[PDB]
Amino acid sequence: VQPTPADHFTFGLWTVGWTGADPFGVATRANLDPVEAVHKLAELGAYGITFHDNDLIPFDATAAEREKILGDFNQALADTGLKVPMVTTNLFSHPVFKDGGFTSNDRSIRRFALAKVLHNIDLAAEMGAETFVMWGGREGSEYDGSKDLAAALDRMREGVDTAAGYIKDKGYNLRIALEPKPNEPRGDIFLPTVGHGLAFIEQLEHGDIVGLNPETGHEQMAGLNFTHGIAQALWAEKLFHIDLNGQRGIKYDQDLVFGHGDLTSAFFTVDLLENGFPNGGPKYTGPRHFDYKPSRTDGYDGVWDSAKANMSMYLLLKERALAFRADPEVQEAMKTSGVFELGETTLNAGESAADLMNDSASFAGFDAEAAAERNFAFIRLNQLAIEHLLGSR
Amino acid sequence: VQPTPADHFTFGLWTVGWTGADPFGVATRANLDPVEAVHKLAELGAYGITFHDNDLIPFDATAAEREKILGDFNQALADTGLKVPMVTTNLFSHPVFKDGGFTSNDRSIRRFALAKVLHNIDLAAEMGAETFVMWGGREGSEYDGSKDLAAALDRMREGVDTAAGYIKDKGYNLRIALEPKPNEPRGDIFLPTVGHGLAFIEQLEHGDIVGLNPETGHEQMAGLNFTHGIAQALWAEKLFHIDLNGQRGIKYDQDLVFGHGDLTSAFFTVDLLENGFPNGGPKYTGPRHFDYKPSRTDGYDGVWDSAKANMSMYLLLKERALAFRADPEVQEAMKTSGVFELGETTLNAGESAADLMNDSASFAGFDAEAAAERNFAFIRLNQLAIEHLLGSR
Amino acid sequence: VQPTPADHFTFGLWTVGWTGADPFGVATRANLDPVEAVHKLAELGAYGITFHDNDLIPFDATAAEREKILGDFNQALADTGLKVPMVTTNLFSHPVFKDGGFTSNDRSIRRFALAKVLHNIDLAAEMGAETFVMWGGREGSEYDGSKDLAAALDRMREGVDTAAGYIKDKGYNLRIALEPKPNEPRGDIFLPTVGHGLAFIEQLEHGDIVGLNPETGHEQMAGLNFTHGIAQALWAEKLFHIDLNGQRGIKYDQDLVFGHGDLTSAFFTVDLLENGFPNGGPKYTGPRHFDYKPSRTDGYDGVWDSAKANMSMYLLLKERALAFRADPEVQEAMKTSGVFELGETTLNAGESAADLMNDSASFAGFDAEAAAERNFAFIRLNQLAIEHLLGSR
Amino acid sequence: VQPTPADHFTFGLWTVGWTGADPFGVATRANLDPVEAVHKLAELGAYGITFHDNDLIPFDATAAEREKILGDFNQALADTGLKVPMVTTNLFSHPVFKDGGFTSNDRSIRRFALAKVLHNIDLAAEMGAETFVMWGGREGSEYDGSKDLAAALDRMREGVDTAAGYIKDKGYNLRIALEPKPNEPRGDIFLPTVGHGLAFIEQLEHGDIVGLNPETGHEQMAGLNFTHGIAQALWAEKLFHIDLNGQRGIKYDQDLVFGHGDLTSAFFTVDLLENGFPNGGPKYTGPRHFDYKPSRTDGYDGVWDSAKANMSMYLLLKERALAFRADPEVQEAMKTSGVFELGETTLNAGESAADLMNDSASFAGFDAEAAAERNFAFIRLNQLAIEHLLGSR
Ligand SMILES: OC[C@@H](O)[C@H](O)[C@@H](O)CO
Ligand SMILES: OC[C@@H](O)[C@H](O)[C@@H](O)CO
Ligand SMILES: OC[C@@H](O)[C@H](O)[C@@H](O)CO
Ligand SMILES: OC[C@@H](O)[C@H](O)[C@@H](O)CO
Ligand SMILES: [Mg+2]
Numbered sequence A, B, C, D: 001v002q003p004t005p006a007d008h009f010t011f012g013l014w015t016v017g018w019t020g021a022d023p024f025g026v027a028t029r030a031n032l033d034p035v036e037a038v039h040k041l042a043e044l045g046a047y048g049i050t051f052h053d054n055d056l057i058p059f060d061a062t063a064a065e066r067e068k069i070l071g072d073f074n075q076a077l078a079d080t081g082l083k084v085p086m087v088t089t090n091l092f093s094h095p096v097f098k099d100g101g102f103t104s105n106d107r108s109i110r111r112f113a114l115a116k117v118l119h120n121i122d123l124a125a126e127m128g129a130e131t132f133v134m135w136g137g138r139e140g141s142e143y144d145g146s147k148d149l150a151a152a153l154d155r156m157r158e159g160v161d162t163a164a165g166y167i168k169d170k171g172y173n174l175r176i177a178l179e180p181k182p183n184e185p186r187g188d189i190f191l192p193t194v195g196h197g198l199a200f201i202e203q204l205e206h207g208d209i210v211g212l213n214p215e216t217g218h219e220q221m222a223g224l225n226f227t228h229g230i231a232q233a234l235w236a237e238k239l240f241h242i243d244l245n246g247q248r249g250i251k252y253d254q255d256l257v258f259g260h261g262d263l264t265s266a267f268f269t270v271d272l273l274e275n276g277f278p279n280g281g282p283k284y285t286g287p288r289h290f291d292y293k294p295s296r297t298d299g300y301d302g303v304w305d306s307a308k309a310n311m312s313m314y315l316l317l318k319e320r321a322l323a324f325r326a327d328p329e330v331q332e333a334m335k336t337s338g339v340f341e342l343g344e345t346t347l348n349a350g351e352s353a354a355d356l357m358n359d360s361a362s363f364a365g366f367d368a369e370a371a372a373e374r375n376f377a378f379i380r381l382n383q384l385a386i387e388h389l390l391g392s393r
């Protein structure tokens, strides 16, 4: 299994550049030069790279400094052939963002935050990014009385709609992808799950160009089914981007390599990305982006091993998911379990409520005890899927 | 503290009628006669009662039997003065619903399920119910390959839109309230949280009369902030009903008395229901419905004690939440923390993106280190709230 | 990868006999006869069967019927050759056990529960069981003031030590195994995890014959590492029996097939039972017991599929972990990461604390920053196990 | 409800000195001088202060500087009268401890870590500490094959017993207290809950002087009942110190003020430390230590508010639990529910197992169905505690 640029594996600069500082310790690794990250990822098989404005250009950087850094980074891009599919803003590390960016209680800070995003749209547009991600990690609270909850969502709408309006005004081919997370760093974050993000988008003035960026570990931190959430995002045609990593349970965000967390759930996520829905439906077409952190125990040899593991994991799952659905044994098991039956509409062509309530076959003379005897055989179909994942089939 | 019918405390027949059977044991209590439940709840101070079609009318009941049961139950209602604000359908206890009602893989079962709901709308309309709740508890899976996830949501939309269309056709004053739950009885349930429910409603043909019925313990089973979720439902004006109970953590659904689970979260939920948003916004106006289960350890003396505890808990929280917001000390603390500041729009009247990006005060000459010095004093405001809850203030 | 009696795969009569009632529904399958259970399990390759007293002998049976059911049961064991390695008592279904068996607040229920256990030890010895399991499912509370916590533990001690002394007194060749569970059906169960259960055994009078009976899903309900937990039971030489199944997250007890929950942890679980410790130490030589429940969506064909599936899953995993450890590239990776290094004692033969303190190269002259540079290469080691698991190596 | 030195409220130098860096951001407050820390804590009513070696003495300090910082530190203790009841070692921040202290895979880090601890025991004795705490924060793994689990426990044993033997050898009047934590910063920490820690102490050579140091939030991260856990530590007479704070659910370690997390459980926690057991038994007479972190949104005024808040919270709760138990209606409710009944032994003075077995009224002639009718009245008992807690009784 070898990743080729056609696989569309993208990595953020902060992923392999994650230095190791956590809540109980300092960094264990030296800073990564951005120029080296670009060359290194291109040798491993990356398609692209992504970044936060402050991953690249320091918060306090002067003008002279900004142009050097960009000169150096466009050089590298040109030399290697890597693309920049997504760009994001850091509205969480500086102490100024302690209560949030867009939903800070201080109005002057909300204004700085939105200014910092607008300037960043320009840069994203100049880099040729298709997607603009917003992760509001400081948007929320520890305490329930800290916020006016309706005001927090109005403030949130103000900023996303101003950023969308500007995109439209400037003529840029960028779509905004919002990224939900339940907790960490705040005790509770606003728009905690895929569902909250999707609901919020519908209340937006310019929601037409606003969609989601779900992350595997983030949905797993609330104990949800990551494959079920992306399937609701796909169905509403709002799956604009995706962040892939691993998580081993409800606890702090681990950011492990994709496949190094819940393995069967990873298998089924690859299946949906690659095979789509069993009865047909929309298909995800974008970057396969890995937002993980090489464990702090490992040196730089581990950093490039970890980057590699992400694409290997993904290609190994892909080989198994294609084989799985290709197996005639699996196709038969699927039909038996009613997987294609689910796709037939419940009512008949031009049948109304009234029409169905009256049908005696459907209700009054329906033999419920008889219908309850069907052996759905879900266990057998799940055993078949695991045997294809373990490659023993 | 005494509940008066003006408090609008409603109870389901299955709550106080919950008999005690759980996964490792049989019932510890005898069945509750519905006639007695109605008299008993009226003596305790209830405003109303709610039920599932099969709580009242048995699955196999004959026609003669159906009329006796309804004759008996309308008599009781007439005698006591209790109202029926909500009615729901049982699409989960009979073995026929083992794979769901609306999203069963078997098409004949989907048809029976929808027939069973349509007939139930009629009954709800005849009882004078304002709300029709749908809790799809068997909608989901244990295994990731069991379902065509897009087909599952299409099937789900079919049934809710057919039920809504019929309401409209018949002229009934009923709104549908969907009720999310992450898991139990299925390993994963479709539309797991408030956010998923809200997102789904937006894809509906007749979503105008479809809203939510959040339950305290259900959002807490995913570790979410129940007050934050109802605040997103309120903001989108989709909070049609509410189920109040307690839950002590991420585990099986406990259905404890309201206030017998996370106490501070209960305080803040009462605050939002009774005081609304600090800067103004929509207010919830419906029944305060308790969907709990009197612990199986307790006899019928405990059943009526438990029903009573629900309304006492609620009135005790209400007394404290009104006092809390009335305290001048709290009002000052709120302003200091920026709670009213959050309500001022971020941009100025007729200010555009461009206009803000250019403002030098807002970005380029913004002193971020200076702004980061503000002491939000969230801890102090949270200490003030707890002292009002403990009534030591 | 056909199990054979040599494999020591045991199954409980209540697993395959589980008819499907969950908290929101009734059974979906017909009762399973125990004679049918023995013949069917023996044709699939099981080595033995386990049961709870009331799984075979009804709570109400007269002596006549007890002896009648036992004769057909022993006949069936005789005809097939299944052994009966473990026996347990039901101290949870009947309404009398609503507050517990051994720790019921009511003294007359504690005596009845203890008498129930003592007569069950006589049947255990009669059957040839080597292990007598105690899962205290109703020992706990929903509310914190429901119990005196010190007295609850004196009452658990008194029952376990009384049962242990009787074993010793009659000269039975039996060991008691406790089974920890965090919750379900009590809100909080006493002795909730493997650790609690090991600590408790150290306060017993008859501790020498008391060990543990850990269950996969039970530790996963508290978010703990199942492999770490049994490691700790094994290291203390208290792993006397084991219950294997699947669980997908912190939620209600799912009891899936082993391998249908956290797959990667199942792999590492099989690795420790099968291979033991890398540097050598204790090993678990007991039966491999499956304590699961066939999903309720499935007929009797799914029941036997499910039972097959347990055995397959364990042999598939078994094979990959033998190949994993035999692999020369894995053994070198292990060496690099320090797995064998941890095997060496920290202090030198004869080195005292005073000695180590005084060794300038261990402390005053140690280069803490040079030592921090080591690449432990845990990501690569982890990536090697997963390729062995996916059957790619 | 003004704390006074008599109350035994202790605070760590790292709590109030916690500057705010979390995983997505830098400090938001200036460093706090330790002399300032002692004076400020002494004006608020603290009885003592605790610290980690590196909280006071930098990792790099020369001997000259160590002695210089200690002289100003002891001066400040002298001027104020604060005691120093517990001392601990930092075996987690420096990059060298990336795989652990005592259980690092690297042997030279195990020796360096142990030497670090041994010299810290000399400082502990010098200060007048009675307790030496060990939180093994980096002892664990992210991946299951990273460690040999039996060897990890031999290496934890060897370090704890070496430290214990040295204490005994020097005649220091010190006790070691272990502090369990399920995760954060390792994916899985060794000795994850109170039980694991108690079981482990029973395999030690020097067990007699080793006890526990449970922390509220740490058990709440595994979803366990904090009151049940310390009950079990207390019952085994292993509760040697206690760390109190707040946690709102299974998620990252929040370290809130005690009482700002699970309020009802805090009440019951205060009830056991303060009142002990209803039928009598052990009592915890040690210091009440607050191991928390002032939220990063707040200035230095919030830091002192937060510290005040800990003490207030505990005295408010203290008052309500003294009133709760003194109340004649609560004592009658306790009697009805069987709280004192559980205090009586199950067997009669002199009754043997054979005797109980043979008593027809305890088993053969027992009316299990009449006994199942008892109303335990646990809901009312629970409702009485909450009205005492809300200060309504
Ligand atoms: O939880 C942290 C988030 O996952 C970020 O890495 C974003 O994806 C981009 O700000
Ligand atoms: O989890 C069970 C649900 O809460 C039901 O009680 C509904 O509210 C109505 O079907
Ligand atoms: O959660 C249920 C427990 O696992 C029981 O099945 C015991 O193993 C047998 O009483
Ligand atoms: O989670 C962190 C632990 O609580 C530590 O603060 C120990 O108590 C002291 O090393
Ligand atoms: Mg992300």
Ligand SMILES: [Mg+2]
Pocket (backbone or CB within 6 Å): B135, B179, B215, B243, B291
């Ligand atoms: Mg409900």
Ligand SMILES: [Mg+2]
Pocket (backbone or CB within 6 Å): C135, C179, C215, C243, C291
């Ligand atoms: Mg079991």
Ligand SMILES: [Mg+2]
Pocket (backbone or CB within 6 Å): D135, D179, D215, D243, D291
């Ligand atoms: Mg601590």
